[PDB]
Design a binder for these strands. Structure first.
Ligand code: MG
Ligand code: MG
Ligand code: MG
Ligand code: MG
Ligand code: MG
Ligand code: MG
Ligand code: MG
Ligand code: MG
Ligand code: MG
Ligand code: MG
Ligand code: MG
Ligand code: MG
Ligand code: MG
Ligand code: MG
Ligand code: MG
Ligand code: MG
Ligand code: MG
Ligand code: MG
Ligand code: MG
Ligand code: MG
Ligand code: MG
Ligand code: MG
Ligand code: MG
Ligand code: MG
Ligand code: MG
Ligand code: MG
Ligand code: MG
Ligand code: MG
Ligand code: MG
Ligand code: MG
Ligand code: MG
Lengths: 142, 103, 58, 117, 48
RNA sequence: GUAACGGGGCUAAACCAUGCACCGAAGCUGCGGCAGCGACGCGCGUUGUUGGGUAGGGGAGCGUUCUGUAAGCCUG
């Protein structure tokens, strides 16, 4: 009698919708990564993706405490000598607010082919509308 | 209908008519063995949890075979220190068939 | 007369060579080992020598 | 009495090259490269007979956590309360019942909650 | 008694040492000599 | 080239004090197997204990060629 393992051709998934108005950026992003991976189920298997799909609405109304609204900084390099760029938290909210939620979640997920496929189940919107009514998402209070 | 018992330092969850492999028991290859401790018995929404044993629960089995397991190899190595060693292993087991379980 | 329980609770790796000779005079061999010695001032004085890695139950 | 090593040496090399089946490139064709590959495979197997007993207890525990939070309790309180009620089932059996009998697992959660009240 | 049924007494036919024949023998490589001296060379040593 | 929290992120998920839970090793306990040494009773039984190793010391073995046993034994 070996331990039960889950099979990718048999896992059942659901659809959920959450809105991020006035919610702390890092405490919201921790619950999102827990369900994109499947840790909330009794069938969790480390090499199989058993999570759910989530829609996140109102991405530009998320919150940060302290002085993080003006002091938090995002860095990246372009691959050319001297190509170090940067932007502040409020700068990116005005330019593409979706990238803020996705950068936080992506760093809390595993690194590898399976971690990349987990990310593909997240749908983030800056407004209050979505075009996924045929999948019938249900309300989750994260 | 299944039941849970402890034998050989391990615990097993068996159903009636199953064949289970255990650590070696010194019992001849044809007769009955009785497991008089049962941790819990479940029979389809009636569940008996023992604290730590179910009152009057008995599992009956019957030995089917004795034998040795598959061989493993042990290798010990120390680089640059002129040391090596090898060994083989083969472990005994005992096979039983679950005949009757009842509280 | 009366006797006491003595148990070893810590390892002997890295100890002074005089602390290892006190453990051999009681008969303790490994962590969790328990022995049975009688209560005399000479036995008590060598419990006190290694009290930081030994537990007593009277 | 002159002794020739030809027949014995060939059998001594064929034995090693047979344990290297499925290895990439020269590791399944050339004796010098393949001898080192076979020794390293035996070092890993000895080490990984210990890690197997760790990787499976880690998976039973992470699976009992998710089933207990469906019932309103955490892993640490569930294990603490089962010991106060004198239940002696281990992590391997518990993770089996969590998947295949969801009603028997709820009977254990109620048992562990009463022992803490 | 036959030509294929006589055997010597026990403890009278110990076998000799062979140097430099692998790890398992306990005498391989340096052959019981140590490392890099005058006493480890071929013909090495000092007079009485 | 961010670059003086491993990272995400944190207003506690920081620090001080007190308490009760749990995780965590090839340590300890449970079950099965092998060997070294010492005692006590007639090679055997019981009992206690030990088994990481370079230089190096001690013990016990596998297999290869040739001589007798052999004008034997095996083999179109
Ligand atoms: Mg499995
Ligand atoms: Mg598995
Ligand atoms: Mg910050
Ligand atoms: Mg890693
Ligand atoms: Mg300790
Ligand atoms: Mg040392
Ligand atoms: Mg101390
Ligand atoms: Mg010849
Ligand atoms: Mg080939
Ligand atoms: Mg362990
Ligand atoms: Mg895991
Ligand atoms: Mg001799
Ligand atoms: Mg040596
Ligand atoms: Mg050497
Ligand atoms: Mg020199
Ligand atoms: Mg020398
Ligand atoms: Mg010369
Ligand atoms: Mg002279
Ligand atoms: Mg710079
Ligand atoms: Mg750290
Ligand atoms: Mg505690
Ligand atoms: Mg650890
Ligand atoms: Mg040990
Ligand atoms: Mg211990
Ligand atoms: Mg034992
Ligand atoms: Mg040794
Ligand atoms: Mg050296
Ligand atoms: Mg031998
Ligand atoms: Mg022979
Ligand atoms: Mg001949
Ligand atoms: Mg011959």
């Amino acid at each position: 009698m070996k331990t039960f393992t889950a099979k990718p051709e048999t896992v059942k998934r659901d659809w959920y919708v959450v809105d991020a108005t006035g919610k702390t950026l890092g405490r919201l992003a921790t619950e999102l990564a827990r369900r994109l991976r499947g840790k909330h189920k009794a069938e969790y298997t480390p090499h199989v993706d058993t999570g759910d799909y989530i829609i996140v609405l109102n991405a530009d109304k998320v919150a940060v405490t302290g002085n993080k609204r003006t002091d938090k900084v995002y860095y990246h390099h372009t691959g050319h000598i001297g190509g170090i760029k940067q932007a502040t938290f409020e700068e990116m909210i005005a330019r593409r607010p979706e990238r803020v939620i996705e950068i936080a979640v992506k760093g809390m997920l595993p690194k590898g082919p399976l971690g990349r496929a987990m990310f593909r189940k997240l749908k983030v919107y800056a407004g209050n509308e979505h075009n996924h009514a045929a999948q019938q998402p249900q309300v989750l209070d994260i | 209908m299944y039941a849970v018992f402890q034998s050989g330092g391990k615990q097993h969850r068996v159903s009636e008519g199953q064949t289970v492999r255990l650590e070696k028991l010194d019992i001849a290859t044809g007769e009955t063995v009785e497991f008089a401790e049962v941790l819990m018995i479940a029979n389809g929404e009636e569940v008996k949890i023992g604290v730590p044993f179910v009152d009057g629960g008995v599992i009956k089995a019957e030995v089917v075979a004795h034998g040795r397991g598959e061989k493993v190899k042990i290798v010990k190595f120390r680089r640059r220190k002129h040391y090596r060693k090898q060994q083989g292993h083969r472990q005994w087991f005992t096979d039983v068939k679950i005949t009757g379980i009842s509280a | 007369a009366k006797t006491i329980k003595i148990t070893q609770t810590r390892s002997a790796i890295g100890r002074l060579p005089k602390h290892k000779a006190t453990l051999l005079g009681l008969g303790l061999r490994r962590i969790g080992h328990t022995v049975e010695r009688e209560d005399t001032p000479a036995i008590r004085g060598m419990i006190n020598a290694v009290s930081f890695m030994v537990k007593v139950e009277e | 009495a002159r002794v020739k090593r030809g027949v014995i040496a060939r059998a001594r090399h064929k034995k090693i090259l047979k344990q290297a089946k499925g290895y990439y490139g020269a590791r399944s064709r050339v004796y010098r490269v393949a001898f080192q590959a076979v020794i390293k495979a035996g070092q890993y197997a000895y080490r990984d007979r210990r890690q197997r007993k760790r990787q499976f207890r880690q998976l039973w525990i992470a699976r009992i956590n998710a089933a207990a939070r469906q019932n309103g309790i955490s892993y640490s309180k569930f294990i603490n309360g089962l010991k106060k009620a004198s239940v002696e089932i281990d992590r391997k059996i518990l993770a089996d019942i969590a998947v295949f009998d969801k009603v028997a697992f709820t009977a254990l959660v109620e048992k562990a909650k009463a022992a803490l009240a | 008694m036959r030509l294929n049924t006589l055997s010597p007494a026990e403890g009278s036919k110990k076998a000799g040492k062979r140097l430099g024949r692998g790890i398992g023998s306990g005498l391989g490589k340096t052959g019981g000599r140590g490392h890099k001296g005058q006493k480890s060379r071929s013909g090495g040593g000092v007079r009485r």
